[PDB]
Amino acid sequence: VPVEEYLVHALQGSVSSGQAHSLASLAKTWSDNEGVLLTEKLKPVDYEYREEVHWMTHQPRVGRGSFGEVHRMKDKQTGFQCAVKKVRLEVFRVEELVACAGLSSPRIVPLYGAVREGPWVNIFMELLEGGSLGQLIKQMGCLPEDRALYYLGQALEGLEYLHTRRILHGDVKADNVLLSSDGSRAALCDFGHALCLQPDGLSLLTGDYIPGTETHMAPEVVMGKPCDAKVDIWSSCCMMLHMLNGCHPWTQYFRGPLCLKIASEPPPIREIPPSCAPLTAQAIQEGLRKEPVHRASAMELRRKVGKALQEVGGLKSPWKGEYKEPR
Ligand SMILES: NC(=O)c1ccc2c(n1)-c1sccc1CCO2
Helix, strand or coil: CCCHHHHHHHHCCEEEEEEEHHHHHHHHHHCCEEEEECCCCCCEEEEEEEECCCCCCCCCCCCCCCCCCEEEECCCCCCEEEEEEEEEEEHHCCCCHHCCCCCCCCCCEEEEEEEEEECCEEECCCCCCCEEEEHHHHHHHHCCHHHHHHHHHHHHHHHHHHHHHHCCCCCCCHHHHHEEECCCCEEECCCCEEEEECCCCCCCCCCCCCCCHHHHHCCHCCCCCCCCCCCHHHHHHHHHHHHHHHHCCCCCCCCCCHHHHHHCCCCCCCHHHCCCHHHHHHHHHHHHHCHHHHHCCCHHHHHHHHHHHHHHCCCCCCCCCCCCCCC
């Protein structure tokens, strides 16, 4: 599409306020200061939006996310607080912005814009004051069954929304589910591993791709086989096990590579706690089928998990409350 050219050149070299579609087109050229901000509350100043000039990170800089790359920040002009994820330009994948720009769902963290500055791509988004589901598991040890189901339910609604639009999330895990301040709303974040799937519907380990979290990789990812939206379902069920047990599946002592065991061993259904209700155990098993064609889709599993939650009397347990011992 060469008539983008003229629009994209107008965007280049500048930070502007604009719409999602413009950000996506600019981001395709990211393989000094430029980008698009999608909300009123972040404003460029004279064609620029520069760290520690127009926006500032919180003063004791601590960092969340796997690489401590996510920070709380404040626009200096407006005072509005939000989150920024820093990504190294040389590793930036176009899909991180092309897949999520223009999505609108309460199960997906809102994108506020992205700005390139030197060797950084700064991705701005809503600051969810409840923190991540990963932080919650760490803080509480492990989650009771009803709360685990509730959050898996919401993640699956997010995945239905993405899969319907031919978007594979690619790193579904507790760390990438963010929570409102009261714990009642969960939403998917981090599209660094996302992939746009073909019309047909249904490769991964080729070209510019960056693999997800290893303990959560489906067998077909690890075997180099063709990959589709079912990869996310496997991955969400490894998250469920993490919620219930307080640790990732496949964690336990062994030397040598874990990717071999995921290929060769049976699925980690033995880690399902014996005290789970039967529909909870059944659902996790249907999401953890080794062959993607035998695995539940997002829609199917979402219905089942909603039923499982009703089967245990609905969401009753406290938001935070009491430490539960893992293992
Ligand atoms: N936006 C927030 O409030 C927020 C808080 C904590 C986070 C994150 N986001 C993100 S964004 C992309 C990845 C991650 C990893 C989890 O750490």
